[PDB]
Amino acid sequence: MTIGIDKISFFVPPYYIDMTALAEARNVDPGKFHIGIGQDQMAVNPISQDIVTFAANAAEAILTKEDKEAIDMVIVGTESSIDESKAAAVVLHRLMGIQPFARSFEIKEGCYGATAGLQLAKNHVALHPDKKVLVVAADIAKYGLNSGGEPTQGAGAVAMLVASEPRILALKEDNVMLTQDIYDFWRPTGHPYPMVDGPLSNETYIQSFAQVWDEHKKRTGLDFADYDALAFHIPYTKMGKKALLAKISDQTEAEQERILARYEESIIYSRRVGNLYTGSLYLGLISLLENATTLTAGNQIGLFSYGSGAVAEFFTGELVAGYQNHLQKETHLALLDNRTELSIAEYEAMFAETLDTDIDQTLEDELKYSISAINNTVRSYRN
Amino acid sequence: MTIGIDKISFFVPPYYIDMTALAEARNVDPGKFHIGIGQDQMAVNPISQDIVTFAANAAEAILTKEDKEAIDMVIVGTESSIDESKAAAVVLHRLMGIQPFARSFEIKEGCYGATAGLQLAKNHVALHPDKKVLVVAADIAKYGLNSGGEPTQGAGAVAMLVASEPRILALKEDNVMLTQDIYDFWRPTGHPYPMVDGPLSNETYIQSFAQVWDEHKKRTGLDFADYDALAFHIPYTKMGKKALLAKISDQTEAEQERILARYEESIIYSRRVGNLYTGSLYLGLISLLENATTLTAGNQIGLFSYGSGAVAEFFTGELVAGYQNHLQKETHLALLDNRTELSIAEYEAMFAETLDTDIDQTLEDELKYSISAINNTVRSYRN
């Protein structure tokens, strides 16, 4: 029996800034971000939108009444939490109207959290084939105006329905995970912004893929030629390409050309969004499913999940026959094309705004599931 | 194949304060603490000790060389995290010398996080019987000096080794879970102390037990008579007694006597520690195992896990033949009996001290795994 991703969708805020405009405002070459880090449009969100906002919208796009009765576990992977004790998943459980006899919790481990959720959800369903699990990656990647990380920013969420007989991707039992205590990226309690060791982040990501790929190759004998496509967690596109290039150098020219073309297809959506942290790898999966025209049922997709901190995992999924009829291509393109482009002034004003949770107030925002009020630090969501 | 807890141990700081002393310092009748909430000694820790310190000491008590090679998943359940991104499980993985190819992450959902870890660990070992999972509840419950919650404070960790063919507790597939969005206890990002609605917390806890118990009885036909003992998560010992008393009101006055005396055995260690959040339920399980003389192999143990926020789960475990040979009573007694009693003045000085992680410094503390230094916000541990 198969178990995997039955439905998957992503949500990004209704705003973005063009990277040419950002480069101009930052007094650097207009094309520096397009050809350097490989990013074109950056998702931006106002203080009236948080991980619950994104998670609720992403999940709403895929849940039916039947799903809500069958789901008995809700997992949110994030490193952008809004509470140190109460899981964002509990609020998501309420907003989605999922049946009450369910377990809900938040998983945290850099940009790896949602992957942990997907694997545990898979086990759960393997053991209870009649039950389903909702796993959502939700995060807001902010580094600060005029900062080094600024151009790699992003915000959004990716929701996944895990179930038996999945209609999209059947997960294999070939997982290879790795844990190494490295301070490449972290965020001490109470730091609104992350601590980043640039050189170490770059090195650890590249070497993480190599380590996990090598061990996986040893255990399975599967090589690049056995993979129809690869989805990567990426802080920005150039990074995944560098990690990939460093490992496929001994492959034939045709194979290298094939692997890099799939990679380009996997980052089509990412170039218009930015870093989603826990949701980046999965945004790449979605891009591959809706944009890669040569993929077909039976193909093998390798997924490299990276988590700063650091924890990494390589695993495989097989495309299910008929999967092309269960995607959200139109909803997704609409979501991206319908965003309001911000001027750099409008963007900086929105980014600098801060939510003081200690102040009782009301917030106005048309987006469904956005913060409507704060009372004694408690958030209300408009739905 | 049976699956469950193979080994278990708890760890608390080497300091405590007498509840009589606290009551006198707070101008309250000592009986309001000893009898009212049912607490006698409160675990207290200095800033040189965090959840890593406690998790590392607890896990080390139960890990052999072979365990460290067979463990491919490290989970830390906590609501006292020290990083918003990097999981505490990653540091624990390093300090424990576990083999590198493991996945490590943190689970957050009030005081329910460890339970979620245990259940997912169970599923993992059920599917991969040759592998083991390290699950650690680790927390520091501080409310504030002269606060309403002050007398219910505690600190420590409970490490569990999950494996197939467990030597202590074989878990049953009878889990009943519940999720409700309730603001009984929470902690907004940036709040050192919890936000608490005492009466809502009190009522939600009592009602949550009733709901999962009733639902469990409906699904299994099992009642109180079929349970040889019960372990409860507890913010303080009278709370569980209150929840229990409300649900056994219609049992024979002899059942009631048996259930209540068994409950008394489950809180012996807890009265000397205080609330451990994720670890409270599991400290009660250890107490039952190590203090309940008439329990034997084959006996059925009911566990009620509560998580503020709120989530709950009732599940069953069976005592494995020979379990009495795989406990850590001597170690635990020494830990509790060897602690240094603090005067209220030493307690307040120790309690109020803050750790400015933004300052590079060196720290002194004899305890193994205590914080030895802070460099660029990064913590180093004494080993």
Coordinates of C-alpha atoms in Angstrom, one line a residue, chain A residues 52-249:
Chain A
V52 CA -1.4 31.2 11.0
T53 CA -2.6 33.5 8.2
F54 CA -0.5 31.7 5.6
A55 CA -1.0 28.2 7.0
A56 CA -4.8 28.7 7.1
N57 CA -5.0 30.0 3.6
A58 CA -2.7 27.3 2.2
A59 CA -4.6 24.5 4.0
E60 CA -8.0 25.9 3.0
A61 CA -7.0 25.4 -0.7
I62 CA -6.9 21.7 -0.2
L63 CA -9.3 20.5 2.5
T64 CA -12.7 19.0 1.9
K65 CA -15.4 18.2 4.5
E66 CA -14.3 14.5 4.3
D67 CA -10.6 15.5 4.9
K68 CA -11.5 17.4 8.0
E69 CA -13.3 14.3 9.5
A70 CA -10.4 12.0 8.5
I71 CA -7.5 14.1 9.8
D72 CA -6.5 13.2 13.3
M73 CA -3.1 15.0 13.5
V74 CA -2.1 18.5 12.6
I75 CA 1.5 19.4 12.3
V76 CA 3.0 22.9 11.7
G77 CA 6.7 23.2 10.9
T78 CA 8.1 26.6 11.5
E79 CA 11.0 28.7 12.8
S80 CA 8.8 31.9 12.9
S81 CA 6.6 31.0 15.8
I82 CA 4.5 33.6 17.6
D83 CA 4.3 31.8 20.9
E84 CA 6.8 29.9 23.0
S85 CA 4.3 27.5 24.4
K86 CA 1.1 27.2 22.4
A87 CA 1.5 25.4 19.0
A88 CA 0.4 27.4 16.0
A89 CA -1.1 24.1 14.9
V90 CA -3.9 24.3 17.6
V91 CA -5.1 27.6 16.1
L92 CA -4.9 26.1 12.6
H93 CA -6.9 23.1 13.9
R94 CA -9.7 25.5 14.9
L95 CA -9.7 27.7 11.8
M96 CA -9.9 24.6 9.5
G97 CA -12.8 23.1 11.4
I98 CA -11.0 19.8 11.7
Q99 CA -12.7 17.2 13.8
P100 CA -11.8 17.5 17.6
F101 CA -10.2 14.1 18.4
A102 CA -6.9 15.0 16.9
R103 CA -3.3 15.6 18.1
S104 CA -1.8 19.0 17.2
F105 CA 1.7 20.4 17.6
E106 CA 4.5 22.5 16.2
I107 CA 7.9 21.1 15.1
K108 CA 11.0 23.2 15.2
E109 CA 14.4 22.6 13.6
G110 CA 15.4 25.4 11.3
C111 CA 14.1 25.1 7.8
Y112 CA 13.8 21.3 8.3
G113 CA 10.7 21.3 10.6
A114 CA 8.0 20.5 8.0
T115 CA 10.1 17.6 6.6
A116 CA 10.2 16.0 10.0
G117 CA 6.4 16.5 10.1
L118 CA 5.9 14.8 6.7
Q119 CA 7.9 11.8 7.7
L120 CA 6.2 11.3 11.0
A121 CA 2.8 11.8 9.3
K122 CA 3.8 9.1 6.8
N123 CA 4.5 6.7 9.6
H124 CA 1.2 7.5 11.3
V125 CA -0.8 6.9 8.1
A126 CA 1.2 3.7 7.3
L127 CA -0.1 2.4 10.7
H128 CA -3.6 3.9 10.4
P129 CA -4.4 3.9 6.6
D130 CA -7.9 5.3 7.2
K131 CA -6.6 8.4 8.9
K132 CA -5.0 11.5 7.2
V133 CA -2.6 14.1 8.5
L134 CA -2.3 17.8 7.7
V135 CA 1.3 19.0 7.6
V136 CA 2.0 22.7 6.9
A137 CA 5.3 24.6 6.4
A138 CA 4.9 28.2 7.4
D139 CA 7.5 30.9 7.8
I140 CA 8.5 34.6 7.3
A141 CA 12.1 35.1 6.2
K142 CA 13.1 38.6 7.2
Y143 CA 16.7 39.8 7.7
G144 CA 16.4 43.6 7.8
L145 CA 16.4 46.5 5.4
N146 CA 19.9 47.2 3.9
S147 CA 21.1 43.9 5.4
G148 CA 23.2 41.2 3.6
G149 CA 20.4 38.7 3.7
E150 CA 17.7 41.1 2.5
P151 CA 17.5 39.9 -1.2
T152 CA 16.9 36.3 -0.1
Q153 CA 13.7 37.2 2.0
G154 CA 10.4 35.5 1.6
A155 CA 7.1 34.6 3.3
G156 CA 4.4 32.0 2.9
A157 CA 3.3 28.5 3.6
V158 CA 2.9 25.1 1.9
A159 CA 0.1 22.7 3.1
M160 CA 0.2 19.0 2.5
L161 CA -2.5 16.3 3.0
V162 CA -0.8 13.0 3.8
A163 CA -2.9 9.8 3.3
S164 CA -2.8 6.3 2.0
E165 CA -3.2 5.8 -1.7
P166 CA -2.0 9.3 -2.4
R167 CA -3.0 10.9 -5.7
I168 CA 0.3 12.8 -6.2
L169 CA 3.5 11.5 -4.6
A170 CA 4.1 8.1 -2.9
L171 CA 6.9 8.3 -0.4
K172 CA 9.6 5.6 -0.3
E173 CA 11.4 4.1 2.7
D174 CA 14.8 5.2 1.6
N175 CA 15.3 8.1 4.0
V176 CA 18.8 9.2 5.0
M177 CA 19.0 11.8 7.8
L178 CA 21.9 13.7 9.3
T179 CA 22.4 15.8 12.4
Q180 CA 25.5 18.0 13.0
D181 CA 25.7 20.7 15.6
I182 CA 26.7 23.7 13.5
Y183 CA 25.9 27.4 14.1
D184 CA 25.3 28.5 10.5
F185 CA 22.0 30.1 11.2
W186 CA 20.2 30.5 14.5
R187 CA 17.9 32.8 16.4
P188 CA 18.4 33.2 20.2
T189 CA 15.1 33.6 22.2
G190 CA 13.9 37.1 21.8
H191 CA 16.0 38.0 18.7
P192 CA 13.5 39.3 16.1
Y193 CA 16.2 38.6 13.4
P194 CA 18.5 35.6 12.9
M195 CA 22.2 35.3 13.6
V196 CA 23.9 34.3 10.4
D197 CA 27.4 33.0 9.7
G198 CA 27.5 33.5 5.9
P199 CA 30.6 31.4 5.0
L200 CA 29.6 28.6 7.3
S201 CA 26.0 28.6 6.1
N202 CA 27.2 28.3 2.5
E203 CA 29.7 25.5 3.3
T204 CA 27.4 23.5 5.5
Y205 CA 24.5 23.5 3.0
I206 CA 26.7 22.3 0.2
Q207 CA 28.5 19.7 2.3
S208 CA 25.2 18.5 3.8
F209 CA 23.8 17.6 0.4
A210 CA 27.0 15.9 -0.4
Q211 CA 27.1 13.9 2.8
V212 CA 23.5 12.8 2.7
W213 CA 23.7 12.0 -1.1
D214 CA 26.8 9.9 -0.7
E215 CA 25.4 7.8 2.2
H216 CA 22.1 7.5 0.3
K217 CA 24.1 6.3 -2.8
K218 CA 25.9 3.7 -0.6
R219 CA 22.7 2.3 0.9
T220 CA 20.7 2.2 -2.3
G221 CA 23.0 2.2 -5.2
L222 CA 20.9 4.9 -6.8
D223 CA 22.7 7.6 -8.7
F224 CA 21.7 10.8 -10.5
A225 CA 20.7 8.8 -13.6
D226 CA 18.1 7.1 -11.5
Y227 CA 16.4 10.4 -10.7
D228 CA 13.9 12.0 -13.0
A229 CA 14.1 15.2 -10.9
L230 CA 15.4 16.7 -7.7
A231 CA 13.8 19.2 -5.4
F232 CA 16.0 21.2 -3.0
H233 CA 15.5 23.4 0.0
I234 CA 17.0 26.6 -1.1
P235 CA 17.9 29.9 0.6
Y236 CA 18.0 31.3 -2.9
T237 CA 18.3 29.5 -6.3
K238 CA 22.0 30.0 -7.0
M239 CA 22.7 28.1 -3.8
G240 CA 21.0 24.8 -4.8
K241 CA 22.7 25.0 -8.1
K242 CA 26.1 25.3 -6.5
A243 CA 25.3 22.3 -4.3
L244 CA 24.1 20.3 -7.2
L245 CA 27.0 21.3 -9.6
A246 CA 29.6 20.3 -7.0
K247 CA 28.2 16.7 -6.9
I248 CA 27.3 16.0 -10.6
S249 CA 30.7 16.9 -12.0

